[PDB]
Amino acid sequence: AISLITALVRSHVDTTPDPSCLDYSHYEEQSMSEADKVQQFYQLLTSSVDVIKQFAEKIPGYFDLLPEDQELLFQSASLELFVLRLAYRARIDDTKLIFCNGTVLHRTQCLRSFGEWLNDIMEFSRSLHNLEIDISAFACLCALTLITERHGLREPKKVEQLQMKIIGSLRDHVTYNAEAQKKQHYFSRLLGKLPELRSLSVQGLQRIFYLKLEDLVPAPALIENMFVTT
């Protein structure tokens, strides 16, 4: 069978909208209520998480974890995966923003719902690209956002072993990747991006919690799951 890193990269590719199939039906700036903008945000977030769900289920060894741990791990990282993919794909000095559900919008249509938090996401985006992360390293970075220690796991040790396997594959790939060895302990700088993502993500919960209290439209279960991590 195929190697872990190739399985990861293929999953990433298979769940990353390709240019020719992007959805532009929401790009055109049109009149819509504050309630509509929240509606759109929830929709955008939930359907993207559904796609991210497809990537996680293809991570070899994931289905070998108990269904309870899969759920806990997924709910706990969904927002992070969402932000990580968003930031990775976003390019500097760009007007658009592409979401893994294929939807494309103006950065300005998102500022309305994301708030200042978006700017922090773009800031993280530039950070990722400064370090230069290839698709193989990124796929591992994503799997590591999902397969990580969380409180309440039934088989924490089983989770850590998969994590170690993913780390191992990332380690091997970095060691032999020429462009990478050209930088100060690239590997360490790579993993050092996860804590930032965690913090960036916490800031997202604040904004999503704000929208929830505003309560212009009900929050989907998927969005409520993001808050269970409290």
Curated annotation (Swiss-Prot):
It comes from the Eukaryota. Ubiquitously expressed in preblastoderm embryos, specifically in central nervous system and intestinal tract. Highly expressed in third instar larval imaginal disks and brain complexes, but not in ovaries. Keywords: Developmental protein, DNA-binding, Metal-binding, Nucleus, Receptor, Transcription, Transcription regulation, Zinc, Zinc-finger. GO terms for molecular function: core promoter sequence-specific DNA binding; DNA-binding transcription factor activity, RNA polymerase II-specific; nuclear glucocorticoid receptor binding; nuclear receptor activity; protein heterodimerization activity; RNA polymerase II cis-regulatory region sequence-specific DNA binding; RNA polymerase II transcription regulatory region sequence-specific DNA binding; sequence-specific DNA binding. GO terms for biological process: cellular response to corticotropin-releasing hormone stimulus; cuticle development; positive regulation of transcription by RNA polymerase II; regulation of adult chitin-containing cuticle pigmentation; regulation of transcription by RNA polymerase II. It is found in: Nucleus. Residues 2-230 form the NR LBD domain. Binds to NGFI-B response elements. Plays an important role in late stages of epidermal metamorphosis. Forms a heterodimer with USP. This is Probable nuclear hormone receptor HR38. The gene is Hr38. The chain holds residues 842 to 1070 of 1073 of the full protein.
